[PDB]
Amino acid sequence: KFAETSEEILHKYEKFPPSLTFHIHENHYRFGDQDGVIPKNSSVIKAFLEYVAREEIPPALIEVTKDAGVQLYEGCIILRIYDHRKTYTTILRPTQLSLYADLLYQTDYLQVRFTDSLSLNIETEILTASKRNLDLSVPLNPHRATANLKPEVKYPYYDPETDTVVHEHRPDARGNMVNADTVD
Amino acid sequence: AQDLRNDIAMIQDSRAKIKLSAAQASLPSVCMYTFHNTNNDLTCLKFNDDSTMVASGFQDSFIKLWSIDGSPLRSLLKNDPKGSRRLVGHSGAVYGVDFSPDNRYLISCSEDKTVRLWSLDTYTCLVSYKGHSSSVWDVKFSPMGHYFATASHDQTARLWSCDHIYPLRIFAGHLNDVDCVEFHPNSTYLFTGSSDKTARMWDIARGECVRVFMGHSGAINCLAVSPDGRWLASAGEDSVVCLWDISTGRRIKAMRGHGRSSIYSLAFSREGTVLVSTGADNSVRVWDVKKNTNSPSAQPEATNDHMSVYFTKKTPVYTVHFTRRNLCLAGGVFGG
Amino acid sequence: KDSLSNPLRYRICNNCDRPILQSCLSKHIKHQVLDGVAKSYPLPLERKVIMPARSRSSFLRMREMFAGAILLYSRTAVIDVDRAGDYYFSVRASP
Amino acid sequence: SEVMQETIWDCLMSNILRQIVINNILQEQALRSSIKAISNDDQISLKEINAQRLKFVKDDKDIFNHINGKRSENKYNGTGADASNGTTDTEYFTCLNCDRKIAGNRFASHVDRCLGG
Amino acid sequence: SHTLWSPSDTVKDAAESLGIFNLNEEAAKNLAMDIEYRIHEILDQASKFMRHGKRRTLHTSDIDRALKVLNLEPLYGYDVSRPLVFKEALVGYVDDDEVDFEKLINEPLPKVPRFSTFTAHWLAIEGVQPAIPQNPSPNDIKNILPINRGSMEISNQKQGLEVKPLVKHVLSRELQLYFDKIVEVLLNQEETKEAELLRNSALQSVRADPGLHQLVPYFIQFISETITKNLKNISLLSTMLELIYSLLMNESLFLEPYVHAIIPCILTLLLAKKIGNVDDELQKQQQLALRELSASLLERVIEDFGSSYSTLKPRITRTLLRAFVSVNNTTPGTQYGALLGL
Amino acid sequence: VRLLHLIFATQNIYSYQDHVPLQLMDFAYRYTTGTLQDATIYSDHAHASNAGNAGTNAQLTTEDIRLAIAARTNYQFKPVPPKELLLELAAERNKKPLPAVIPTWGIRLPPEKYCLTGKDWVL
Amino acid sequence: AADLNRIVLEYLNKKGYHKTESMLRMESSHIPAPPTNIPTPQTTNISRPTAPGRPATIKRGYSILKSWCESSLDFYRPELEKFLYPVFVHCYLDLIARGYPSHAREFYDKFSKDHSVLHEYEISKLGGISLK
Amino acid sequence: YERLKRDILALPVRERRRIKAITRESGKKGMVNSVITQTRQALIPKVPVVTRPTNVPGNSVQWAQDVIHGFQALLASEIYELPEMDNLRTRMTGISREHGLIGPVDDSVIEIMLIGLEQHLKGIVEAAIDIVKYRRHTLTIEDMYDTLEQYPYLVEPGGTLLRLQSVMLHDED
């Protein structure tokens, strides 16, 4: 019953709203019960959208998300986007920075007698193993750990005329060429 | 393939009790290589693949290739006219060296945040590499070639290729220095071990840590992987070898021995039946590994899982290399 | 003498199951101080923390965005103008 | 003087060792003759000597099984109810003062109310 | 006070050497605190550099580098040679003075040591540790018991005396039965159509399979028993020649220790001094061929193990030529084998 | 100093060379000199120096020392493990794909003009 | 010890996509892997040098044939020398019909110099053919 | 050696001082030495809120609206130019309130700061120019990494150098 998959997390973990719904109507950006609105402010929401075009939850949701929802609201998220040109949804996941943030907001209380570097370290040895009971530990034979079948090669040869030759990959950038984009 | 099928059935009949079943333990042979006259100016050794050369990285930017069994070390050129080849091209001490499994190249890390590549048909550098902010301890190839990895004091590890000159991936999960790096036999995982008394695993594509193993009051220095994909070895200043299972994240066994000294190097068999530790208490220590594991091979007549210990003439030992065959091959220093 | 030298030596009566001590059977049938002190655990005065402006700025920005959106009200510290120079401070934790 | 002193110490040491070994061999010969199917001695609930090849009574490194190798309740597992596999919660004692089966974890509280009478 | 490094005099010495007077006590306590922490800091870094040089006796290069990595200024002027004194001095004690100075001219030349060259030997053949070459004797009983802990461990018919192969407990319960299956499938010798097909795959199994360095000498004694028990069966000697071609095509087997015990089988077979060998239309139609196969096997053996021994090819050449020229061969076939082996 | 050996005993390093204690004590002297020097400057700064405006009287509380040390560790003294910085930075690197190519059983080098060609250097 | 179980279970209680069912499976980080086997080259084929992000076996079989023979005894040379060429031309015909005519050409003129002392016109017989 | 060492340490009269240093020092409300709490406490914004036992002068109440405003600025490295006064002033008030001061920056600080800044950067680029050409060229990133390998005393480590070793991309990408 292993469930630490990517597409299966969306296919099976569906049909229930612990989510955060987004809202778009081609000019504003919104999620949840938001009194306000976000315009095309690339200082913020493009940092968000960069992550959400991938499947990573940003590092920063966690503490507000935790203090907001007491349960049934975490582990991961899915976001509810719907256009006005349909409705769409797609999944986001941790990155080990979200997980390290899951240790930070635990530090605003009991800073003393907490053995931080010990306890909050050993916590991860259990958590990381428990999140992931699906690893792929399976070998396969090379030509190097057996015998009688070592192959031949002809790149590092010795011409009679020239000294030796090698394998060296191929760009298109030449010398005395245009350096890069404009200065703006 | 009718007679072919009958002969395949005959091979299957050989499988019935004519083919060996267990391949139980087998106590090893050894051949030692003590390096005299160095004034302790010597960090690492490393042996070849087909067991013809042994390279030692000194502490003044020097790499002194040695030839076992003769002096054929001559270039293919017309110039460059005994069997010891010295490599320059470095600024600081050398801490790790590794060979190419096609065995016409060589890689060598240092404390001057360089990684460098050498040929072996001209004994000559080709490339320099720089993406690291601090000393690089150990550099190891992939089991297949093409990709190599490094460990540093910058509390991070970088996985390189050989064609591209700047790193491809950077791995960051250590609250102290990453002492050692190794690749699991599929070549899609890396095991870092550190002075923070913890060990970690990484997906080269992902970047981020699949598993973390904690124990071992003390540092870490060397790691090993058993060929079949269950088993990693943790060796550290604590002097207790720990065998770890990747899926469990909890050590299957805790081999106890080796007095009270740092354990510098270790290795498994060709078929995972046996391992070997190798230490600074002037002793090597063969351990059985299947005494209490999921394959309890016992074969009956301080703690157990300890077949034999071979002492040396006041020599701290630095490495091993199981050959294809039964025997080990060792490297130590200090003579008497 | 030597109370744990051997097990309790007794027999059991087959009539009433009582454990009987042998003598009762017939009647029932009828310098280093400084090493221990040297545990100083020294400390520094101040430590640096490598934290640029950009990382914490993006973090804090997105933080207060979500904080004003879902529910100052964010999770903040509290430092007094006096008796500062200490190293850890309390927190408001206002929801 | 050293050789004579080592000789005196060795006579003291060997006599003491022989006395301890005689006590051990006789006790264990008595236990084996008395109980031919000996798997465990009487022992106590408190752990004795650390487990060995002549460890009597079931010793669990994991701390979960008793001297007969059986589960007590060292696992707080379950389905949120009926958990423990039924340890003392699902046991009962017949009270002779009122003729009722009483849950064993409630015998003390039952006694105070029952013996009142 | 708080910790080590008593700030009543140490920090006082520092400040009063600077030229101040007013350092409150608690300040100097805290200062002792800081400098002690910096000490532990640099010390751990130089340890990190220590255990890469895989040494223990921390030298000054360790701390010098450990400074260079902390973005901290270096420290010059501390040479290993010309050792230290810490001479005393008293005032109405301080225990400090250095009286190693007053030089005017130096004209000494340093002497170069040998280069770093390596000394191989042999150690631990098959579990047993020789003491004859450069090794220890049992003198680690005198070592300090926390350190170096734990300790478990006549003729050309020799295969090993310090290994103790007599006790039959080492092999296994499994391995005796495996060996029985092997020998029984070998010594079958019933038909000419299926028996070779029934045994050849076990032959080609021991050709290539792992962990066989436990049961080698049992195998050796068994096959030597086979040759000394019987001389007539072309079948058994053919199978044994092919078996030795098998054991030598293996890749997971080390066979230095036993060449000087397998040579006699090949030679006593290749000569093949037959007391009988009656005329049977196959006394020589293949006996020559069997001798030829053994000779080629011999060529292989000498070509392989001609580096770990020098006396072998010598001994082999001497044996065969002594058996060659003797007119009392009593048969041409032995001399033919000698000729085709030479 | 014997107490320096006593401090060595805390880390299981009883293999010194006897130059280390001289050297580390010299170091700490240098360090604390600089420290309580610039702290004295700051104690002057609170005492409002220029080319004659007031006197210079020393107290040297702990706050000044704290100031004089935080400036040093502003550019020295390997700080707490900056994990979060590295995590985000490495996620920025750990973002663009692998090459996903096959050099077909050899080594693939950088192109010449990025390779070195370690010839005898010459003018 | 048990405090770690307490705290991680409270954590997983707060993680809304970790219910009580699968949190206990999360506590099954104490069952290890089964004893598995090493991939001998009996059944499992080789893999190619690639990336970690997801023909010519004929050539390697012929390489086996030319390696295992020459590494054999001297008695067996005069008979396997004639076992070489026919299977070579057979496997060349097999691959050039399989659909890799370029590969066929390359390992042909690579291994055309196999039996040049016996066969003289056959190299011209098979050199004037490229396409299926 | 250890026993003899302790005995010789007792030979000094400081055996008494050595005997007293058994407790745990920093007799305060605390000095934590962990990592994560240093980080967090060095990450959240602080707030200089004040007491008032009898009178805490200043005549200007403390605010943390200023800290939010400071962290919200379009700081450098997004824009392509060094910041003009106003941005820098808005960022400073934030830092001063966030450290535990009060009172407004007084419009001369910003200018001296800009001055020191442009001096800094002229020094750096002069260094790189001294690298590339000895006596029509155009400069790259690698030359600046070279000169920040040679001269690292210029820049304070942290933040940017690590970021500098994560921008050196290869040609095709």
Side-chain angles (χ1 to χ4, degrees), chain C residues 38-47, chain E residues 3-4 30-31 33-34 36-38 40:
Chain C
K39 293 302 312 312
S40 55
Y41 189 73
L43 279 301
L45 266 288
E46 319 303 306
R47 292 189 103 97
Chain E
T3 77
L4 297 77
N30 275 307
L31 206 59
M33 205 81 67
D34 209 74
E36 191 66 13
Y37 177 68
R38 274 82 172 92
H40 287 91

Short mmCIF file of all heavy atoms in Angstrom, two decimals, chain C residues 38-47, chain E residues 3-4 30-31 33-34 36-38 40:
data_model
loop_
_atom_site.label_atom_id
_atom_site.label_comp_id
_atom_site.label_asym_id
_atom_site.label_seq_id
_atom_site.Cartn_x
_atom_site.Cartn_y
_atom_site.Cartn_z
N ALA C 38 36.07 19.70 36.35
CA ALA C 38 36.43 20.29 35.07
C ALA C 38 35.40 19.94 34.01
O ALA C 38 35.65 19.11 33.13
CB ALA C 38 37.82 19.82 34.62
N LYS C 39 34.24 20.59 34.09
CA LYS C 39 33.12 20.42 33.17
C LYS C 39 32.58 21.79 32.78
O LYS C 39 31.39 22.08 32.87
CB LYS C 39 32.04 19.56 33.79
CG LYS C 39 32.46 18.11 34.01
CD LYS C 39 32.89 17.38 32.73
CE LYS C 39 31.92 17.56 31.57
NZ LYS C 39 30.51 17.33 31.96
N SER C 40 33.50 22.65 32.37
CA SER C 40 33.23 24.08 32.20
C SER C 40 32.11 24.35 31.21
O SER C 40 31.16 25.07 31.53
CB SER C 40 34.51 24.76 31.76
OG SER C 40 35.03 24.14 30.60
N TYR C 41 32.20 23.79 30.01
CA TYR C 41 31.30 24.13 28.91
C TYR C 41 31.36 25.63 28.64
O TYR C 41 30.39 26.35 28.90
CB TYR C 41 29.87 23.72 29.23
CG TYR C 41 28.91 23.84 28.08
CD1 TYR C 41 28.96 22.95 27.02
CD2 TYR C 41 27.95 24.83 28.05
CE1 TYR C 41 28.08 23.06 25.96
CE2 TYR C 41 27.07 24.95 27.00
CZ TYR C 41 27.14 24.06 25.96
OH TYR C 41 26.26 24.17 24.91
N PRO C 42 32.49 26.13 28.15
CA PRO C 42 32.58 27.56 27.84
C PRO C 42 31.63 27.94 26.72
O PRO C 42 31.10 27.11 25.99
CB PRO C 42 34.04 27.71 27.40
CG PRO C 42 34.41 26.38 26.94
CD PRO C 42 33.78 25.48 27.92
N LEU C 43 31.43 29.24 26.60
CA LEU C 43 30.58 29.85 25.59
C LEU C 43 31.29 31.01 24.93
O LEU C 43 32.32 31.48 25.42
CB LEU C 43 29.27 30.35 26.21
CG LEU C 43 28.12 29.39 26.49
CD1 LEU C 43 27.68 28.72 25.21
CD2 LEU C 43 28.46 28.36 27.55
N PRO C 44 30.77 31.50 23.81
CA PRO C 44 31.17 32.80 23.29
C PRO C 44 30.30 33.88 23.90
O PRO C 44 29.48 33.63 24.78
CB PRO C 44 30.90 32.65 21.80
CG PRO C 44 29.71 31.81 21.76
CD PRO C 44 29.84 30.83 22.89
N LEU C 45 30.50 35.11 23.42
CA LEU C 45 29.57 36.21 23.69
C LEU C 45 28.54 36.34 22.58
O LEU C 45 27.33 36.33 22.85
CB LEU C 45 30.35 37.52 23.85
CG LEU C 45 30.71 37.89 25.28
CD1 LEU C 45 29.49 38.33 26.05
CD2 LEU C 45 31.38 36.72 25.95
N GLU C 46 28.99 36.48 21.34
CA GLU C 46 28.11 36.70 20.20
C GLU C 46 28.51 35.78 19.06
O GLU C 46 29.69 35.49 18.87
CB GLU C 46 28.19 38.14 19.72
CG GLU C 46 28.23 39.18 20.80
CD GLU C 46 27.05 39.10 21.75
OE1 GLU C 46 25.90 39.14 21.27
OE2 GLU C 46 27.28 39.01 22.98
N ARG C 47 27.51 35.34 18.31
CA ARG C 47 27.71 34.58 17.09
C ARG C 47 27.10 35.33 15.92
O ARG C 47 26.08 36.01 16.08
CB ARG C 47 27.06 33.20 17.18
CG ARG C 47 27.70 32.25 18.17
CD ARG C 47 27.11 30.86 17.99
NE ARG C 47 28.02 29.98 17.27
CZ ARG C 47 28.87 29.11 17.81
NH1 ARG C 47 28.96 28.96 19.13
NH2 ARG C 47 29.63 28.38 17.02
N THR E 3 35.19 29.76 34.62
CA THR E 3 35.72 28.63 33.86
C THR E 3 37.23 28.56 34.03
O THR E 3 37.82 29.16 34.95
CB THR E 3 35.38 28.73 32.36
OG1 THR E 3 36.23 29.69 31.74
CG2 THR E 3 33.96 29.10 32.17
N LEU E 4 37.88 27.81 33.15
CA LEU E 4 39.32 27.71 33.13
C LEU E 4 39.90 29.05 32.70
O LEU E 4 39.18 30.01 32.40
CB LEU E 4 39.75 26.59 32.17
CG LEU E 4 39.33 25.14 32.47
CD1 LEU E 4 37.88 24.88 32.14
CD2 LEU E 4 40.17 24.11 31.73
N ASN E 30 33.94 37.06 31.44
CA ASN E 30 33.33 36.84 30.14
C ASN E 30 34.39 36.75 29.04
O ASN E 30 34.23 36.01 28.06
CB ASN E 30 32.35 37.97 29.85
CG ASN E 30 30.98 37.70 30.43
OD1 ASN E 30 30.38 36.66 30.19
ND2 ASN E 30 30.48 38.65 31.20
N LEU E 31 35.49 37.47 29.21
CA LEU E 31 36.56 37.43 28.23
C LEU E 31 37.26 36.07 28.23
O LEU E 31 37.56 35.52 27.17
CB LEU E 31 37.56 38.54 28.52
CG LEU E 31 38.41 39.10 27.39
CD1 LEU E 31 37.53 39.65 26.31
CD2 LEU E 31 39.28 40.18 27.94
N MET E 33 35.78 33.45 29.04
CA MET E 33 34.77 32.61 28.41
C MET E 33 34.96 32.59 26.90
O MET E 33 35.04 31.52 26.28
CB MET E 33 33.39 33.15 28.75
CG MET E 33 32.28 32.14 28.71
SD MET E 33 32.17 31.11 30.18
CE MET E 33 31.67 32.29 31.45
N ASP E 34 35.09 33.78 26.31
CA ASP E 34 35.18 33.88 24.86
C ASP E 34 36.44 33.23 24.33
O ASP E 34 36.39 32.44 23.39
CB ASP E 34 35.13 35.35 24.44
CG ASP E 34 34.53 35.53 23.06
OD1 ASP E 34 33.30 35.39 22.92
OD2 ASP E 34 35.29 35.82 22.11
N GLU E 36 38.34 30.98 25.62
CA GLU E 36 38.29 29.53 25.74
C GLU E 36 37.43 28.92 24.65
O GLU E 36 37.77 27.87 24.08
CB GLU E 36 37.77 29.14 27.11
CG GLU E 36 37.91 27.69 27.45
CD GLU E 36 39.33 27.24 27.58
OE1 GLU E 36 40.23 28.10 27.65
OE2 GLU E 36 39.56 26.01 27.61
N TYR E 37 36.29 29.55 24.34
CA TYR E 37 35.49 29.03 23.25
C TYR E 37 36.24 29.07 21.92
O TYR E 37 36.15 28.12 21.13
CB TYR E 37 34.20 29.79 23.09
CG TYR E 37 33.44 29.26 21.91
CD1 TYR E 37 32.91 27.99 21.92
CD2 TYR E 37 33.30 30.00 20.76
CE1 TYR E 37 32.24 27.49 20.85
CE2 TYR E 37 32.63 29.52 19.68
CZ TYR E 37 32.10 28.25 19.73
OH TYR E 37 31.42 27.73 18.67
N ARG E 38 36.95 30.16 21.65
CA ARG E 38 37.74 30.24 20.42
C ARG E 38 38.78 29.14 20.37
O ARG E 38 39.08 28.61 19.29
CB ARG E 38 38.40 31.61 20.29
CG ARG E 38 37.54 32.67 19.65
CD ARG E 38 36.58 33.29 20.59
NE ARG E 38 35.89 34.43 19.99
CZ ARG E 38 34.74 34.37 19.35
NH1 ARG E 38 34.08 33.23 19.16
NH2 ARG E 38 34.21 35.48 18.86
N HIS E 40 38.52 26.06 21.74
CA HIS E 40 37.85 24.82 21.33
C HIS E 40 37.48 24.85 19.85
O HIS E 40 37.55 23.82 19.16
CB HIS E 40 36.59 24.58 22.16
CG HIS E 40 36.86 24.12 23.56
ND1 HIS E 40 36.99 25.00 24.62
CD2 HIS E 40 37.02 22.88 24.08
CE1 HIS E 40 37.22 24.32 25.72
NE2 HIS E 40 37.24 23.03 25.43
#
